[model samples]
Target: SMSVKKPKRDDSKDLALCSMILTEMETHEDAWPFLLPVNLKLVPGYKKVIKKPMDFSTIREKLSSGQYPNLETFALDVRLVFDNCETFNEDDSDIGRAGHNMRKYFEKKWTDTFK
Candidate 1:
């Protein structure tokens, strides 16, 4: 159920892309570790789910809590997801490059808006 709708001028494409990442993380359990501990305290029953394997539905459900409290809070969790994958693919490959690009993309998005 991806939102193909147009974004309002004030809306953040960073949040859009971050939401896409969350959707992928939702559908693909294999991607969970890379984005775990999403720190969604606004989510009803959220807790610090550190090393344990979290359920995809749980994360997805929590993500539905609506718009992030603010840009700073959203960016913080996005950085966390990228940080979790600092060494994601030591063996250079397209996947590794893509991951790096995603981190860079969001970083730039944050900077462009915050600067």
Candidate 2:
């Protein structure tokens, strides 16, 4: 038999997939609202509402610094970004709409990617 078939969940494979998906998420048009953390000066109450703020930039930094440890944590943080967006913005609002669109994009991509 060959050494392995796709070598599931090895740290390097997981990290590479997570890394690739993250950059793809960043480049998406609806990703603008998620590209960075909210500015407290503009929305000073944000921290009060979302105790654990998450963003693409933060995810990127964490990934680079080896903070996620596994794909599950990375996925959780990505979902957290969208969850915070929905909590903070109205569904009819521009950013909120983008959040939904971006979430859909991520889920579809994340599943379709690993095949």
Candidate 3:
């Protein structure tokens, strides 16, 4: 279920958006590239991910487990998702719909976790 209840975010929409991207990346089978070689904090692309709702525990889990086989592809997909986020500006589509749109780039985005 999408969190229709968006909290009053005055300063962190970008971070929220970045977290969304990371959340999406968690589901891909090929996410190891972005995670296995180093800690998430050490990733050059860390700045690229938004520290949203400010909680990185889950992404941290992925990192500690040495999974995430498709990290390079995941990063590319995250960039694309962040790029398309402008669509959310004027529209109020629910998470499910947004995930559907995002799946065009990464088929895994439609997973339940994404919603």
Best by lDDT: 2
User: Which runs in model 1 stand beyond 4 Å of their true positions?
Assistant: 1-67
Better of 2 and 3 by TM-score: 2
List TM-scores for all candidates, in order.
0.43, 0.87, 0.25
Answer with 1 or 2, whichever has the higher TM-score. Answer: 2
Question: Residue by residue across 14-100, what tens digits does model 2's lDDT show?
Answer: 888889999999999889998988897788789788999999999999999999877889999999999999999999999999999
Candidate 1, run of 10 with poorest lDDT = 44-53
Stretches of candidate 3 off by over 4 Å are 1-11, 38-115
Residue-pair clashes per candidate? 0, 0, 11
How far does residue 29 in candidate 2 sit from its true spot (Å)?
A: 0.8
In Å, residue 77's CA in model 1 sits off its true spot by 1.5
After TM-score superposition, what is the CA distance of residue 49 in candidate 1 from its true location, in Å? Answer: 13
* Every model: Cα RMSD to truth: 11.3, 4.5, 14.5
